[PDB]
């Protein structure tokens, strides 16, 4: 009962089906890793190292395009300097440097893109200060970036006019994205795909059930995160924060199926804090030895590996350190084998 | 402070001069009118072509083609009557929360978690669909889109904002800020000259499209809301909230007039839309099966049932002639 | 947006000869393409026609196993063998295109063409007239009668209408009896019952006389019809 024009229209959408199957075959070689963890713990940092070590995409002008945002960060660290020198209300030893605060003070971070003399001689000068380094010495309280001490060391290799970011410089800017950043590679013709979710700010009922069934969620903790407190409440714990959050990723039914891996990261850091500073006095609980590297990881691990409500979940866990570059290659290696023998497809076997 | 108490004495007035309007609700009115009975509904025809749960679909202005969004980052263009398929067409950015039909029948219009709503041109040389503006500059997460025109475009995301743009010069050319939770749905008057626009605050608005100002503002849920949709004569709307509880206010009177609600329903609403006549809502819920809901009784009329997962769409064509459903199977359902 | 072809010479009857039609510019993995004969003296002749993918394969009955069109899609040409050439065989060869979907319009770009000599039921369309002596400033109006009802359960009709300046290639002027194709002034606009459908060129202008053709697609083998030659 048809015609002889449609017929046309049939063969059109036969051969789009067609079209489809091979799309529908080739998505079913494919494991999303979903990466969580509280902010500056390092989320960024394992994308970059990852995209080295097998991808090798870093090309000199792709280097270049980070200079304007080494500049904001050496600006936006040296301003929250002077932000916790005044908070503290420490005084000045010097004049000038009273007054050399007001000309980096009030300065626009975005449109800032290269330097002069004055920039220099200015941060140069204000670095001198024995009130500066005490007030670095007492980063507790005002959180300051973590990653400051590398730049402000090396103000005049900047300073310079010939400047090009070296591969060590580059992984240790933090780029501006507000879009989930998603990053495909291929290992052993198996294809990977991982997406970043730490760039959202708005409220996170509303986008998270688009994320059902993801194979595998990698959550990142910082180690030496567990000193810092804020003096904007009068309690405040980094840790019970990410806790927190811990404990509420755990209870939603979107991730049983998907197993979980967490990672511990700023390794080297903790070792180097330690030495002056003791655990018990922050957690009531801990009653092993003092100046220990080894008592506080294994506190630490065990309270994460306990805090499971399900009681029936194998949770693993490795220590990294999120700088070096064949500790990743390693550890990465390690997962890909205990992530990929603990997945299966079902094909038809009921 | 003192603005905090006078803002409390603003509200106090507008309470009491509106509950002074209220006089008589409309349930004694409606009282001597004759029940719809009972209303059964058929499958016609299941479109099937997908590989990954369905968000959004659009009907139409022709009233018989349909475009439908997937996960799969492919959306694809059924026609109806039929059955097969015209034009599968792929995008980038692989995560996709809406989509949208041009009335003129040129252009299709979809965004997503990438913060980018890629216009796309239909009808060009060569006969392959390309993109056109990749349309650009809101932060956050577009949520929905609906053409105006062959030329202006509103938009709605996670900052709290609603933006027009136009699309051959591409940049903004009006705000309409004031919320303070996150808009969740759009829809635009029949005459094309007032939107209202749902937040998570529980809190509808009414933006005028030419001045830029707010001009009313509706409260009175408890919950975040989810779907709007007007009545088709322009005077009144519904609203489907998280509590379960689907609500009418016309816009009039300034006031709620009549609530739905029942006690053996706990679930969301995810979509909301009248029938062309106006006197049947059809509903959407978890519960696996849409309802039919009278407006002026606030008594059922049956099911449709069919569906393993929630119902993510509706649709209602332009003639009050079919009903198409969309649920996280990989299915369309066509019903008449 | 361009197609060129080649072969063109003398052959001797008894032989072999390959025909190409080349394709730039366009995705050329998904237009249908056909073959059109148009004698020296006389209207068009459908020649042979190949669908998307080799899916579909038709003939003219009068040419049923002599011809063979194949299509190199991943270098974009296409091929047509011939043997046996009778001495009918002399023409002009056009290579067109058509794509067919709901909303679109088939036949929308002719080829240049080529050239080729040599040396030594289905429904019938009519025309009722042949010359017509212009009257510039005014209407006009054509007619063309068939031999069966061309409305479809469906409700449409596929009844086309041409234009072809003198030296020139075809192109498109009327769709399905109602449309008109995106090019083209508004000027011109088509009625008909179903018998017989009639065009009325309103405001005739310069340099619109052309040579028309009434062109119907209802089953294979779609033919065409003698026209009319507008003169003055």
């Known amino acids: 009962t048809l015609s002889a024009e449609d017929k046309a229209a049939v063969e059109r959408s036969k051969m789009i089906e067609k079209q489809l199957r091979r799309d529908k075959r080739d998505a079913r070689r494919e494991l999303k890793l979903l990466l969580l963890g509280t902010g500056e713990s390092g989320k960024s940092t394992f994308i970059k190292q990852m995209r080295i070590i097998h991808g090798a995409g870093y090309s000199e002008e792709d280097k270049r395009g980070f200079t304007k945002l080494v500049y904001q960060n050496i600006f936006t660290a040296m301003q929250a300097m002077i932000r916790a020198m005044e908070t503290l209300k420490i005084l000045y030893k010097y004049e000038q440097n009273k007054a050399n605060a007001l000309l980096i003070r009030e300065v626009d971070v975005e449109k800032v893109t290269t330097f002069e003399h004055q920039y220099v001689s200015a941060i140069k000068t204000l670095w001198e200060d024995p009130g500066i380094q005490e007030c670095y010495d007492r980063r507790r309280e005002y959180q300051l970036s973590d990653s400051a001490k590398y730049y402000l060391t090396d103000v005049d290799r900047i300073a310079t006019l010939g400047y090009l970011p070296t591969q060590q410089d580059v992984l240790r800017v933090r780029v501006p994205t507000t879009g989930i950043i998603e990053y495909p590679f291929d290992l052993e013709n198996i294809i990977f795909r991982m997406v970043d979710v730490g760039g959202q700010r708005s409220e996170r009922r509303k986008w998270i059930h688009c994320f059902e069934n993801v194979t595998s969620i990698m959550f990142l903790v910082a180690l030496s995160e567990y000193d810092q407190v804020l003096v904007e409440s009068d309690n405040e714990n980094r840790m019970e924060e990410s806790k927190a959050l811990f404990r509420t990723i755990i209870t939603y039914p979107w991730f049983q199926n998907s197993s979980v891996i967490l990672f511990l990261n700023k390794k080297d850091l903790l070792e180097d804090k330690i030495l002056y500073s003791h655990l018990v006095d922050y957690f009531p609980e801990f009653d092993g030895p003092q100046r220990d590297a080894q008592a506080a990881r294994e506190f630490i691990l065990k309270m994460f590996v306990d805090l499971n409500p399900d009681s029936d979940k194998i949770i693993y866990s490795h220590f990294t350190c999120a700088t070096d570059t064949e500790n990743i290659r390693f550890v990465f290696a390690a997962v890909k084998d205990t992530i990929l023998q603990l997945n299966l497809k079902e094909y038809n076997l009921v | 402070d003192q603005l905090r108490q006078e803002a409390e004495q603003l509200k106090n007035q507008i309470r009491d001069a509106r509950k002074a309007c209220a006089d008589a609700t409309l349930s004694q009115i409606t009282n001597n009118i004759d029940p719809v009975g009972r209303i059964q509904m058929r499958t016609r025809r299941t479109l099937r072509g997908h590989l990954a749960k369905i968000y959004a679909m659009h009907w139409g202005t022709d009233s018989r083609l349909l475009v439908s969004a997937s996960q799969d980052g492919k959306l694809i263009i059924w026609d109806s009557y039929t059955t097969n398929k015209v034009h599968a067409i792929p995008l980038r950015s692989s995560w996709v929360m809406t989509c949208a039909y041009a009335p003129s029948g040129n252009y299709v219009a979809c965004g997503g978690l990438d913060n980018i709503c890629s216009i796309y041109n239909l009808k060009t040389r060569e006969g392959n669909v390309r993109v056109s503006r990749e349309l650009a500059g809101h932060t956050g997460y577009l949520s929905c889109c609906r053409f105006l025109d062959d030329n202006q475009i509103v938009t709605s995301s996670g900052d709290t904002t609603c933006a027009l743009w136009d699309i051959e010069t591409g940049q903004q050319t009006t705000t309409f800020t004031g919320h303070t939770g996150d808009v969740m749905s759009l829809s635009l008057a029949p005459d094309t000259r007032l939107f209202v626009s749902g937040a998570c605050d529980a809190s509808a608005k009414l933006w005028d499209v030419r001045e830029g100002m707010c001009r009313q503002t509706f409260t009175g849920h408890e919950s975040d809301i989810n779907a709007i949709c007007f009545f088709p004569n322009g005077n009144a709307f519904a609203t489907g909230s998280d509590d379960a509880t689907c609500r009418l206010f016309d816009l009039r009177a300034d006031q709620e007039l009549m609530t739905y609600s029942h006690d053996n329903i706990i679930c969301g609403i995810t979509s909301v839309s009248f029938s062309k006549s106006g006197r049947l809502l059809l509903a959407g819920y978890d519960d696996f099966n849409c309802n039919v809901w009278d407006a002026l009784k606030a008594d059922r009329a049956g099911v449709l049932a069919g569906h393993d997962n929630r119902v993510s769409c509706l649709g209602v064509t332009d003639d009050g002639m079919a009903v198409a459903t969309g649920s996280w199977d990989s299915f369309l359902k066509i019903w008449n | 947006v361009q197609l060129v072809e080649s072969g063109g010479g003398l052959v001797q009857p008894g032989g072999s000869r390959k025909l190409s039609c080349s394709a730039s510019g366009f995705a050329f993995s998904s237009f249908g393409m056909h073959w059109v004969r148009q004698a020296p003296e006389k209207g068009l002749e459908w020649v042979a026609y190949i669908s998307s993918g080799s899916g579909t394969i038709y003939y003219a009955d009068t040419v049923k196993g002599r011809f063979t069109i194949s299509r190199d899609d991943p270098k974009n040409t296409l091929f047509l063998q011939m043997t046996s050439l009778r001495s009918e065989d002399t023409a002009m060869y056009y290579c067109?295109?058509?794509?067919?979907?709901?909303?679109?319009?088939?036949?929308?770009?002719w080829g240049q063409g080529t050239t080729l000599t040599v040396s030594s039921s289905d429904i019938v369309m009519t025309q009722a007239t042949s010359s017509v002596p212009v009257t510039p400033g005014e209407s006009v109006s054509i007619s063309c009668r068939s031999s069966k009802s061309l409305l479809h359960s469906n409700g449409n009709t596929y009844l086309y209408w041409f234009l072809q300046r003198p030296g020139q290639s075809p192109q498109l002027l009327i769709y399905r009896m109602s449309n008109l194709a995106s090019g083209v002034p508004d000027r011109f606009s088509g009625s008909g019952s179903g018998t017989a459908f009639t065009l009325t060129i309103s405001r005739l202008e310069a340099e619109d006389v052309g040579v028309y053709y009434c062109?119907?697609?209802?089953?294979?083998?779609?033919?065409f019809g003698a026209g009319t030659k507008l003169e003055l």
């Open positions: 067109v295109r058509s794509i067919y979907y709901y909303g679109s319009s088939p036949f929308d770009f």
């Open positions: 062109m119907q697609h209802l089953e294979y083998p779609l033919t």
